Structure 1
Amino acid sequence: KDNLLGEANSFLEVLEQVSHLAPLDKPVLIIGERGTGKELIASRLHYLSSRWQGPFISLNCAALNENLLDSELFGHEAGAFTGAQKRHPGRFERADGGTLFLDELATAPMMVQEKLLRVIEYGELERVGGSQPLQVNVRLVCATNADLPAMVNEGTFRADLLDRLAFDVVQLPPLRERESDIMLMAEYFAIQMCREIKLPLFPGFTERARETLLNYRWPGNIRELKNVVERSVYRHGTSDYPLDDIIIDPFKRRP
């Protein structure tokens, strides 16, 4: 499919579950830490999914405000629209039969929440008069980094609607918990950045870098992975000289 970061037993099982869900057009949930890219994984699995070649929706959550699905997802394609009349494309109508991914869906308001709840209850929220229904055939996807478990417990979203929006919630475990893909990512990023930073060679994570990583809590995980990647890009040293002090923390004050 695509070049992938992480082939661990957990990562491999994730790939297997992705294959299982790929036929499953029923909406599901892939949970994980941000700065990893589970959305890209969803895109690859969608290429493997029912829509082997189909549409795709990015749909960052807080990209629409005071803009209903009717404003953007449904659109104003027909005549007699607001202002002077013309054609206007709509997302949720545009990408039927493809992929419908919701980015940072945990970042959500109550009103859009009530909208999407009915959209799920009816297949799509539809437009205008209450006599008009709709359904969307795109592969519905969504993800964020928040444990909604308490958000619904706090009522930030409708708990029943939360239950409705998916059919199988899956959570990506911490890469820091893995801490084995540490070396694999280090090497892959070393090659990629040697191609990028145009270095003579990859310095290689010397003993101190490995020890620090072993001690590192790595809160950002894949986010912290790219963070350490940039950090070592700062701490290049020499292409020959293996990087023992590879990490570079911006917050710290040297000397």
Structure 2
Amino acid sequence: MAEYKDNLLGEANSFLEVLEQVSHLAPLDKPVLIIGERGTGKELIASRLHYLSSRWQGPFISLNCAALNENLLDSELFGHEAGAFTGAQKRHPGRFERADGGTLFLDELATAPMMVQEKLLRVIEYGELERVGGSQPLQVNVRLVCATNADLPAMVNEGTFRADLLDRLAFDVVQLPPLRERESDIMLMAEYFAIQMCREIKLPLFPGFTERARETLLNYRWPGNIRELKNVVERSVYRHGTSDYPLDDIIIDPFKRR
């Protein structure tokens, strides 16, 4: 509900439309898909969805679907009421349940193994997750929001990703425009990144931007995303020096031998 303090810096007149779209999704409990490319700041949008929802007071755990162990999947997702030691007074909590009352964020959906895919598909459709041991089903209420950069229709075509959980979890998608599509906010991000760098390196003052530098970073196909642009500025501002002259040289990729 309360707008958390985050950097979205939106002026592209397309990012504003995406922001309105996600704001419309803020109250609803329906599953949400975030579609983007490398970088693109999808995590900020996901945090925006969770943190402007009715259940925002709830927790906001975010699991890395690539990071879950294969064998330990069941206990990791559910937990075991039995303690680690004899006569234990408590148990470890699984990924699920630890999310109840709030949203669960999923990332790298495409690279999730088939074991994760099939185990996660069963739990969402019905809930009633049961920890290993005992016969007591616990009912859960968790919002799911996920972000990915690969092409899950192609993943379905190859069959390396099950289409059923996709269909269940594809109520609505939000499209994120690439930085090259935005092509208007580059000045403001460049400047904000440079100002942050000024304090990080403890440089005294920002020198300024030359027209040649503006032309070169503007006239770029930008396969890299906002973070690639961020790193670019980071490299050039440091290589420039102590701001006695305006910033003049931009190195697009630090790989050319020279």
When normalised by structure 1's length, the TM-score is 0.88
Report how far residue 194 of structure 1 moved.
1.5
Contact 1:232-1:246 within 8 A present in 2 as well? yes
1:252–1:142: structure 2 CA closer, same or farther, 3 Å change rule? Answer: same
Task: Give the number of aligned pairs.
Answer: 254
Matches within 5 A, 1:124-143: 125-128=129-132, 133-143=137-147
Higher alpha-carbon deviation: 173-182 or 117-126 = 117-126
Higher relative contact order (CA 8 A, sep 6+): 2
Deviation at 1:181, TM superposition (A): 1.3
Per the alignment, residue 231 of structure 2 pairs with 227
RMSD between superposed Cα atoms in Å:
2.6
Check the 8 A contact 2:6/2:44 in 1, yes or no: no
**Partner SS, residue 210 of structure 1:** helix
- Using the alignment, how far apart are the partners of 2:86 and 2:111 within structure 1? 29
Contact 1:55-1:138 at 8 Å conserved across structures = no
* Alpha-carbon distance between aligned partners in 1 of 2:234 and 2:75, rounded to the nearest angstrom: 40
Equivalents in 2 of 1:233, 1:135: separation in Å? 54
1:78/1:87 contact within 8 Å kept: yes
**Matched position secondary structure for 1:63:** coil
Task: Determine the C-alpha separation between the residues in 2 that align with 1:124 and 1:63.
Answer: 24
2:217 maps to 1:213: yes
Per the TM alignment, residue 17 of structure 1 is displaced from its structure 2 partner at its CA by 1.2
1:231–1:247: 8 Å Cα contact kept in structure 2? yes
Change (3 A) 1:80 1:38: closer
Question: Secondary structure of the residue that 2:233 maps to in structure 1?
Answer: helix
Change (3 A) 1:211 1:15: same
- Give the conservation status (yes or no) of the 8 Å contact 2:180–2:222: yes
Residues 132 and 34 of structure 1: is their aligned pair in 2 closer, same or farther, counting only changes over 3 Å?
farther
- Structure 2 CA distance for aligned equivalents of residues 56 and 130 of structure 1: 28
Q: Is the 8 A contact 1:115 1:125 kept in 2?
A: no
Gaps of 5+ in 1: none
Determine the C-alpha separation between the residues in 2 that align with 1:164 and 1:29. 11
1:202/1:7 CA distance change after superposition, 3 Å: same
Q: 1:246 to 1:80 in 2, by over 3 A?
A: closer
- Please give the secondary structure, in 2, of the residue aligned with 1:44: helix
Deviation sequence 1:73-106 (CA, Å, 0-9, x none):
2111345999999622222111201120012112
8 Å contact kept, 2:110–2:148 = yes
Tell me, which stretches of 5 or more residues in structure 2 are unaligned? none
Shift of 1:40: 2.3
1:120 shift after superposition: 2.2
Does structure 1 conserve the Cα–Cα contact (< 8 Å) formed by 2:40 and 2:176? no
Residues 163 and 81 from structure 1, CA distance in 2 versus in 1: closer, same or farther, beyond 3 angstroms? farther
Q: Deviations over 1:208-231 (max 9, x none)?
A: 221111221111211212221222
Check the 8 A contact 1:228/1:247 in 2, yes or no.
Answer: yes
Q: Sort the Cα spacing of 1:169 and 1:15 in 2 relative to 1 into closer, same or farther, 3 A.
A: same
With 244-253 and 76-85 compared, the bigger mean Cα shift is at: 76-85
SS in 2 for 1:199: coil
Q: 1:132 to 1:57 in 2, by over 3 A?
A: same
Tell me how far 1:49 sits from its aligned partner: 0.9
CA distance in 1, matches of 2:186, 2:60: 31
Per-residue deviation, 1:156: 1.3
Compare 44-53 and 92-101 and name the one that shifted more.
Answer: 44-53
Mapped contact 1:120–1:165 kept (Cα < 8 A): no
Deviation (angstroms), 1:236 = 2.5
Deviations 1:130-164 (A, max 9, x none): 97655432321111211112111111111122111
Separation (CA, whole Å) in 2 of partners of 1:82 and 1:35: 46
Q: Deviations along 1:105-147, whole A, 9 cap, x unmatched?
A: 1211112111111122213654458976554323211112111
Does the 8 A contact of 2:208 with 2:247 survive in 1? yes
More deviation, 239-248/14-23:
239-248
Percent identity over the alignment?
A: 100
Change (3 A) 1:103 1:10: same
Question: Displacement, 1:28?
Answer: 0.7
Paired residues of 1:69 and 1:75 also in contact (CA < 8 A) = no
- Report deviation, 1:3: 2.6
Cα pair distance change 1:77/1:250, threshold 3 Å? farther
